[PDB]
Amino acid sequence: GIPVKLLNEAQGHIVSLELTTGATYRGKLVESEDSMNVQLRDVIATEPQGAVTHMDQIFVRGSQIKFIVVPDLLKNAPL
Amino acid sequence: EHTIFTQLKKNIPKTRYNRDYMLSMANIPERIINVGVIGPLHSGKTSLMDLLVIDSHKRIPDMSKNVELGWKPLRYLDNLKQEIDRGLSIKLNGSTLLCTDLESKSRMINFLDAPGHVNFMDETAVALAASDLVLIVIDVVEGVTFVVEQLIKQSIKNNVAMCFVINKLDRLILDLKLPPMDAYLKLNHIIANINSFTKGNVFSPIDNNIIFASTKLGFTFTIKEFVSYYYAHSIPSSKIDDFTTRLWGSVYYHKGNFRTKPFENVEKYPTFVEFILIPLYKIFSYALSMEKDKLKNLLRSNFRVNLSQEALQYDPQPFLKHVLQLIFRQQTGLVDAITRCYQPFELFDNKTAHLSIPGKSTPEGTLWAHVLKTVDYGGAEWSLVRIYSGLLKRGDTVRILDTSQSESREDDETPSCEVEEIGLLGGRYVYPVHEAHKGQIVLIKGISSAYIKSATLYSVKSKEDMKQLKFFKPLDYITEAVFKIVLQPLLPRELPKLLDALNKISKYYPGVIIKVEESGEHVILGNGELYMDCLLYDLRASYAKIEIKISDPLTVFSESCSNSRLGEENLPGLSISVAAEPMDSKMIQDLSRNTLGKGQNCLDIDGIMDNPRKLSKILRTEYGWDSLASRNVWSFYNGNVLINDTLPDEISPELLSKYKEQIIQGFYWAVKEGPLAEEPIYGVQYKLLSISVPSDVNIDVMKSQIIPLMKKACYVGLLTAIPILLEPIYEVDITVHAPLLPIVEELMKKRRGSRIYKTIKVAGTPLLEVRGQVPVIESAGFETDLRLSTNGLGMCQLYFWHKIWRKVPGDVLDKDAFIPKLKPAPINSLSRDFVMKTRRRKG
Amino acid sequence: HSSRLANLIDYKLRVLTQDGRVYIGQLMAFDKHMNLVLNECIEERVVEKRVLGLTILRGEQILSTVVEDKPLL
Amino acid sequence: GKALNNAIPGGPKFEPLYPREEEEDYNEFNSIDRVIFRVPIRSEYKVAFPHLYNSRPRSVRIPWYNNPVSCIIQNDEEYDTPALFFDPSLNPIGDFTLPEDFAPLLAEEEELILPNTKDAMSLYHSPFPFNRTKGKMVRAQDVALAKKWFLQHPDEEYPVKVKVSYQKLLKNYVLNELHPTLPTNHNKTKLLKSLKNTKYFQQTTIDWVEAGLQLCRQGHNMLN
Amino acid sequence: MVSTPELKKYMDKKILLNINGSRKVAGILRGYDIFLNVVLDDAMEINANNHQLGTVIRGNSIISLEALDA
RNA sequence: AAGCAGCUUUACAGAUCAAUGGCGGAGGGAGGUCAACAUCAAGAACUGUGGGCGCCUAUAGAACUUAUAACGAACAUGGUUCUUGCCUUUUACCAGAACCAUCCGGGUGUUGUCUCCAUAGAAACAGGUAAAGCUGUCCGUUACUGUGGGCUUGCCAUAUUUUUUGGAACUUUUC
Ligand SMILES: Nc1nc2c(ncn2[C@@H]2O[C@H](COP(=O)(O)OP(=O)(O)OP(=O)(O)O)[C@@H](O)[C@H]2O)c(=O)[nH]1
Numbered sequence A: 001g002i003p004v005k006l007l008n009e010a011q012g013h014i015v016s017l018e019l020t021t022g023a024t025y026r027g028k029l030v031e032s033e034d035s036m037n038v039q040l041r042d043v044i045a046t047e048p049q050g051a052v053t054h055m056d057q058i059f060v061r062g063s064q065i066k067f068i069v070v071p072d073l074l075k076n077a078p079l
Numbered sequence B: 001e002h003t004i005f006t007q008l009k010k011n012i013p014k015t016r017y018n019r020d021y022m023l024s025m026a027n028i029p030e031r032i033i034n035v036g037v038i039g040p041l042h043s044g045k046t047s048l049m050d051l052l053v054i055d056s057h058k059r060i061p062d063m064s065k066n067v068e069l070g071w072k073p074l075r076y077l078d079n080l081k082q083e084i085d086r087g088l089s090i091k092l093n094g095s096t097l098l099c100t101d102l103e104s105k106s107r108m109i110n111f112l113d114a115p116g117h118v119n120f121m122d123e124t125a126v127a128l129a130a131s132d133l134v135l136i137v138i139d140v141v142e143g144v145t146f147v148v149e150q151l152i153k154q155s156i157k158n159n160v161a162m163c164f165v166i167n168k169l170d171r172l173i174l175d176l177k178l179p180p181m182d183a184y185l186k187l188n189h190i191i192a193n194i195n196s197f198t199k200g201n202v203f204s205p206i207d208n209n210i211i212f213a214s215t216k217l218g219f220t221f222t223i224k225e226f227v228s229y230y231y232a233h234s235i236p237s238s239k240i241d242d243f244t245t246r247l248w249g250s251v252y253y254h255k256g257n258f259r260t261k262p263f264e265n266v267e268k269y270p271t272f273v274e275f276i277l278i279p280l281y282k283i284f285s286y287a288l289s290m291e292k293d294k295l296k297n298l299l300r301s302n303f304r305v306n307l308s309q310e311a312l313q314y315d316p317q318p319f320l321k322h323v324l325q326l327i328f329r330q331q332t333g334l335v336d337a338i339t340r341c342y343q344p345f346e347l348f349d350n351k352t353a354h355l356s357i358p359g360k361s362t363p364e365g366t367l368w369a370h371v372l373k374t375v376d377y378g379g380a381e382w383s384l385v386r387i388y389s390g391l392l393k394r395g396d397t398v399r400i401l402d403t404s405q406s407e408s409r410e411d412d413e414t415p416s417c418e419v420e421e422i423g424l425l426g427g428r429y430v431y432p433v434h435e436a437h438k439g440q441i442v443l444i445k446g447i448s449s450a451y452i453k454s455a456t457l458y459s460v461k462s463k464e465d466m467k468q469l470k471f472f473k474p475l476d477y478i479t480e481a482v483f484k485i486v487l488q489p490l491l492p493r494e495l496p497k498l499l500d501a502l503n504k505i506s507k508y509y510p511g512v513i514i515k516v517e518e519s520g521e522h523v524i525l526g527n528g529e530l531y532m533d534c535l536l537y538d539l540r541a542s543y544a545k546i547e548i549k550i551s552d553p554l555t556v557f558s559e560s561c562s563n564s565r566l567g568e569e570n571l572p573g574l575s576i577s578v579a580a581e582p583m584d585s586k587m588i589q590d591l592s593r594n595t596l597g598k599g600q601n602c603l604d605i606d607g608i609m610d611n612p613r614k615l616s617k618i619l620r621t622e623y624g625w626d627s628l629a630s631r632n633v634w635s636f637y638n639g640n641v642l643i644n645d646t647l648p649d650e651i652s653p654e655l656l657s658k659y660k661e662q663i664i665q666g667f668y669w670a671v672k673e674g675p676l677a678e679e680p681i682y683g684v685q686y687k688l689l690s691i692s693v694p695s696d697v698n699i700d701v702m703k704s705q706i707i708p709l710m711k712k713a714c715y716v717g718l719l720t721a722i723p724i725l726l727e728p729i730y731e732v733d734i735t736v737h738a739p740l741l742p743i744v745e746e747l748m749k750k751r752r753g754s755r756i757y758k759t760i761k762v763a764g765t766p767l768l769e770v771r772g773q774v775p776v777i778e779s780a781g782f783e784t785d786l787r788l789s790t791n792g793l794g795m796c797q798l799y800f801w802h803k804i805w806r807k808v809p810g811d812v813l814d815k816d817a818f819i820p821k822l823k824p825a826p827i828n829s830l831s832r833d834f835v836m837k838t839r840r841r842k843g
Numbered sequence C: 001h002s003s004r005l006a007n008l009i010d011y012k013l014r015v016l017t018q019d020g021r022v023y024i025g026q027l028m029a030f031d032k033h034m035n036l037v038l039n040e041c042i043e044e045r046v047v048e049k050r051v052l053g054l055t056i057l058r059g060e061q062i063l064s065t066v067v068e069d070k071p072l073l
Numbered sequence D: 001g002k003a004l005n006n007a008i009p010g011g012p013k014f015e016p017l018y019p020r021e022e023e024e025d026y027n028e029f030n031s032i033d034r035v036i037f038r039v040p041i042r043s044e045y046k047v048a049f050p051h052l053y054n055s056r057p058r059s060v061r062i063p064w065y066n067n068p069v070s071c072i073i074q075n076d077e078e079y080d081t082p083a084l085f086f087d088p089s090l091n092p093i094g095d096f097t098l099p100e101d102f103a104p105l106l107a108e109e110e111e112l113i114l115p116n117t118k119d120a121m122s123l124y125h126s127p128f129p130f131n132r133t134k135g136k137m138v139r140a141q142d143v144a145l146a147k148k149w150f151l152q153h154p155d156e157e158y159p160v161k162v163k164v165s166y167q168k169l170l171k172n173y174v175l176n177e178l179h180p181t182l183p184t185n186h187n188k189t190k191l192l193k194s195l196k197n198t199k200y201f202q203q204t205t206i207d208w209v210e211a212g213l214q215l216c217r218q219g220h221n222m223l224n
Numbered sequence E: 001m002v003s004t005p006e007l008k009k010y011m012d013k014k015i016l017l018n019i020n021g022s023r024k025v026a027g028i029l030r031g032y033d034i035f036l037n038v039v040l041d042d043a044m045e046i047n048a049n050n051h052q053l054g055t056v057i058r059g060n061s062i063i064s065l066e067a068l069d070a
Numbered sequence F: 001a002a003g004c005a006g007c008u009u010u011a012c013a014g015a016u017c018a019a020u021g022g023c024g025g026a027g028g029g030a031g032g033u034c035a036a037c038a039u040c041a042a043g044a045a046c047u048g049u050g051g052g053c054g055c056c057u058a059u060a061g062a063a064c065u066u067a068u069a070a071c072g073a074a075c076a077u078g079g080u081u082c083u084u085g086c087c088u089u090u091u092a093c094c095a096g097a098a099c100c101a102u103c104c105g106g107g108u109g110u111u112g113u114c115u116c117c118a119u120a121g122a123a124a125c126a127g128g129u130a131a132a133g134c135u136g137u138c139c140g141u142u143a144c145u146g147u148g149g150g151c152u153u154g155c156c157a158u159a160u161u162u163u164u165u166g167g168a169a170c171u172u173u174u175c
């Protein structure tokens, strides 16, 4: 399915996302999955409060993701 | 700027993925990749890159109607006139290509097409220091011969990942006409024989490290591929991944179930044969033999393909290709294994550490790059580089250095040049580039002037970062030149132009050694006949227009001995006594092999910087070496090992420790030359038996004194040592038919050494692989003799490996034996002849 | 099936999510889980707006779908 | 071979094409005292590598090198042996199950071998005319049957009489190839097509022999 | 399915886990699972009162996993 | 790869029997041992001319490249200028070069014919170029149904941890 391949193609670029938690994470993406797992670096979190933090490495569960936000050149990619 | 790009895009025959998304993918380091392609003669390299390019560009201007039907194989990445007229790849040329995959996630890839000829092995090394992983292409008919052995060996030594591509299977079925059961056994024999020489990793079609392709008919296979596009539709998806495992390896399925049992019941074939080989042979026999009306039904029924009657009218061959490229689509199976086989973290640190030394600091935050090849394109000359760190842009001032100046290790240390333009290599075209990103191999204009052969390139803003950075070691070429020719210009007034051209040669040709003598004659050292023939054509045509005179093919020799010393200073306060010893063959072979001593391998002497307890531990451990001598080992040479043995070493160790550097410079100076022919010395050990120094030494011991005295003592020490003259020997790889074996034998008997090392039945083909050894002075016109005498059946490759120098049977100095002039000398004295002949050139 | 879903392709859509937020933009890619990809997106949390760009939503998160405008040339 | 005035033992010999061999000089470069003498340096070497074993080559074309040395096998004696057959010249060299319905897609035919596939794979390697099923028409004197015979080796057994003929035919072939014409005429329409026109001619059919006899009487009457 | 995650590089190293209910744990990484169930040794709570325990954390719960020292 | 449904058509009974919309048609097919007239290796890019709306197409000239890929898997003669034998010279020649020609052939386009063959017709009208449904009108089925064909389709069927058989439900305070 194409909605997963687009993700794999944004590996390397910087990504923004939203979780069921309520917070948004922003950073370079290293690995993804068909599940929608993620592996990122130099993340800059921002919760409901506005509280910023730093997280060196992160793994996720896709189930917990609401939606992603992806770079602009990834609209000319082949489907 | 923008305008120049507007004229340059019109030359480029555009693309299906255009340039924007591929140029966009360059930022992420884990994205893209770099890959070289290597193999023997005519393995399908350049035609495989042909496949990737025709899957790349939508409209190529060069196609005749003939190449599109594929009667004559199209050659992309052979640009030059020599490459087309000769018929073989000469200079390496790459293609920057965005490739999708089965995962639909595309990546940029930098392909490097290396020549397959042995005389050009040097440039393959230039692709080794560049590529991250390498595709070794094997002929299913030829199988693997010694050159593949030494390719997977050099490959695994240089810390690059290996993909194996078994090519020309259509030559397996069509030419040799093997049944399925025998063809599977043949591929399996090739796989076992490629696995035998690899240590620590076993391959198998199941592990996706082996790829079955035919570049002519233009198809490519991995088992995951041919399973995914077809058998994945038919049966559920959870069973396919374990089905792939249940494909290879003796598994047999009777009806709907598989049992490893021998073949019990009746109708019996293996799974790989049943699901792959048999349907392939069916594709061929049906495409050729069957009525074209019948085939449409099998295409629609099985593969869901429909064809126009125009496709049904070609000829047997171009219709076969149209059917194969039709059924098996654009090749993402190759890109799958190329994507999987290279993981940057595990290999990369070992690969960069193998050159820049393992110590690393100042990560990222610096421009760090390595210049390998000076390429001749339509304009001028261009610099092929790999980008290890940092960002390049047009007009950037860049620091440059040379590999030898790096061997030597503030102000006066920095030559610098601006980067005028950076292209991506498009083979026949070049793509203009604003900015160069980490990991990608790019072309640059303006950097060539500061270097010859390899170069180290960096930009550093910090002092500590200047201190921590470590330069690239000089690129180790795969073969030593060894093939000697004396050029003069036909009209001496034209000497300067030739000079210029020669320098240009040394730039574009990494394996050439240009030496200027006393008389102005220009000695050129090159790998073989063909290589130096390309040298001479580019020298008379492209570069220098001067008509030139060429001498008779010759070779470089060496000096040795087989077993006391009195010496006197020009101001007789010094005395030198140095013994001369032959060396063990095991020690010689361990020195000639360049290694870090990893595993159980004997340590190379270049690691002497490690604790001499370790070096002495290696010497004593392997050779039973003398403990005192092992600890008294001083250094190695440009050449053999140097040791200090005497009591005054104990008497005045410090006074000698002041002269050690004098001895070590004047010594390299001495053995770099020689007493007989002024040629380097091979396999000769020295020990310093005595040293006598002036009294109170008032500026008395000096380099101008000790150095030429040590030099003379080494020379006459070699004279009293019963010296010998040394000749290099090619190892010969011949492929002939069985009934032609005696002829080859006589050929060997006719030349000089007549030494055949091995004779090997080539399994599955009517070919003999004959390994042998030939003197290089006799190697002239040997290939043509073999080819003519055998009426076009068979072939010869002369490769220089193990770098062995065999003794010349002639007496070393005997004025008595030599025979009249213009007569080839007798077998009894060939040493006196060669020595004298070089002597009257030296003076 | 999914015959209707292909018909929506390349139309500006109004997608309500479980959070209440509503995304808007064209539809480039579609899934069996109802993963939607959307181009030039804009949330309307509610007198509010934000510019995101390319957004990939999950199936869990999506509630309803509705065409805003016809397919663009 | 023509340009360098060095010929193959079985190839044709031409004139020099470059007049002056006259220059002969000893020198510190040339001197036989400084040159190591081994190998004959046969002329085949000068032709095989024209920029190396030959000094100052001129008007020389870059030769082809090293084709793969094809292995192809063929059986001329018994055709009863199958198309895929191992030839004597060749060196000796409980978990998961799915329904029985599926098979190899293309295997619904029992045997891949056909009566026409052996001759077909035998036509896959054939000279130009036969390997192509579609072509264009040529005049009878255009097709050259014996051209292939004198491009080959005389081998051994033949007498010198026919070998010299091989060399002569080769010489004529090389001259015919070396100097082409490539004429382009849009202007001329056939002397016969424009000739038949108007009154003085009429067109019919005749036996070939009768046409010959007519033409003979015409020639005789005209010379008389 | 069942992509065995890339936790080989964390084995036998200290960690700073976070779990559901804003509760977090330090420990040496012993072993991991398909579903990301974890084995930690020398487990210490972070309430700020740090209690030594000696533990198998469930996969579902896990939010993230960090490294204390580079 | 069967069936169902959807799509395309189809022999069609059809809604309309209007305005529509689609696909084709407003100059047939094949073959001339038929002729006339033009050209004619291919490609990027420079200059000039003409047409249509800076762009596109055609023609001419120059330079570069390809293996001069083979208008011809053929190859024959002559002239001039040079170099080789000639002693004679004429006829002819001997055997290499270069520049020219001539001759036997080929394909492509277009025009006018000839033979054999095809059934709707709307092949009807008016505009022009070097060309044509090129354009405008126009008409054949027809744009929405059911029977009959093909597929480009459903992707092929999972309630127990990463999406479609729910951790939801509910309350209260702040602005
Ligand atoms: N029969 C057969 N020959 C093949 C096939 N693929 C490649 N070849 C051989 O490869 C030759 C042409 O391939 P090239 O790519 O030009 O040669 P190459 O492999 O680049 O050789 P190098 O330039 O020396 O590396 C042909 O002469 C073929 O004999 C194949 O599928 N079948």
Ligand SMILES: [Mg+2]
Residues within 6 Å of the ligand: B045, B046, B047, B088, B089, B114, B115, B116
């Ligand atoms: Mg090649």
